[model samples]
Target: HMLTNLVAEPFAKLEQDFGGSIGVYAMDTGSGATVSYRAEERFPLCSSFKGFLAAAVLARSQQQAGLLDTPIRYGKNALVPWSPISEKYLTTGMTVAELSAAAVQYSDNAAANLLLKELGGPAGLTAFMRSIGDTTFRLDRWELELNSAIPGDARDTSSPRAVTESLQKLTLGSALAAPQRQQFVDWLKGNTTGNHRIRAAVPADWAVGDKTGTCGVYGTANDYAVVWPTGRAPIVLAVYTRAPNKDDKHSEAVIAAAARLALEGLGVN
Candidate 1:
């Protein structure tokens, strides 16, 4: 209740600031304080599923020790229009670990699709999520492409709670082995995008590991992260905004404000 009250004002302001739907969920790992505003609602993830794909790959590597080290060839066939890999790394070779890093750090659609191909397609990811008992999440389409069977379908979908739970599981080593879990977190910390969202107002000394999703044409901007403030425990935060406008910087700012509110609400300076 304390957390809820502390975040209420900022949460309410986000709806108007984002110009559409908004969801906020945060949990303090050490204090056990949590808050959620529409966190159960399903939201299209766009590129945010990159993180999930990477996690699934890491989980798969548990059985195949050399899984991450295996090299995957990249060519024009794998290239999509928008991604670091597509724009720069055509006709090259990269290890599974490198692909995972590209996906997690830069939201590289081609790298993600390559990893998905290695995992056996969307079905593989679906099975992985089911194995983890996260039924509300779905990965049904490849990046930068639509499901030919259905027109105008969502590429991927997950709730704030689901994504947050997945992140928590990965961090706690429930999703991957100890070494792989550390590798996953390291990739997240190396993320080169979404710096202006959840990380915007964080403490200077804090360590924030996060992933961001953006579908500019469809007006979806989402961010999920684990924040470790100086002298304080870690916290998981997930924010989603869906608006009618194709692009809205306000949505990003709203996510930042909500993150700051979560930190302040949890009594973190």
Candidate 2:
């Protein structure tokens, strides 16, 4: 009955009207402080870890040591079975930037694996998580099967508080070179073709940049976004979802709720 009521509330009210297990957090990009809501709660990152991966690559770039276009053969080593990417783009050669693009723009598995390999394989991704100030973020080999294994609550994947912290770095130009920062922002702004919860809420004219994560089964789906519009509202939103059933509805609701919360917090009409 507990599950029934809770599920009913979210499914009928939240998902149907608003949308899924959605939570949003916003912050003052200038002061690096929280501006609103239960966003600090960590939901499943889904595929959004690419943001961190992007940061990691930029971090490497900062040291004047990064592979801009280091071609590597994508043979059996990069292959991930059952992935939606394999049918069209299987083994091929790529560079670091290419992998980074695939990881972010398309949430490509092979591209992520390539980056994962560079980040010391699995261990390296954990290091990057810590590098970005996530002490409790954990990484597991088995995580290849599940969603991203951040050290915090697996069910509730990320803290809105943490996402804002990352956003703070992103906006301040601290995590990356100025040009790279701009490039990263440009990449985020170009995102489209996403069906995750976060993307479903924004208007086409809005300059919104984000990353989404999702998988089948009772799994985690996550989104991190930045919306920019002159005199409109500039906000960072992160949505994390763990749904029992697999469908696009959970993501849709989650994004819609987060969008409303961010706009309301900004006093947007």
Model number with the top TM-score: 1
Off by over 4 Å in 2: 1-20, 30-37, 64-66, 81-92, 148-156, 244-249
Q: Quote the RMSD, in angstroms, for model 1.
A: 2.8
Writing each residue's lDDT as its tens digit, candidate 1 over 102-145 gives: 99999988888889999899889878888887887888778775
Compared with the true structure, all predictions reach lDDT values of 0.79, 0.59
Q: Which candidate is the best by lDDT?
A: 1
What candidate 1 gets wrong by more than 4 Å, as runs, is: 146-155, 245-250
For model 2, residues 157-261, the per-residue Cα lDDT tens digits are: 457557656755664446666887886887676655364455566666667778777654343566777876556436676665555455433445556665555
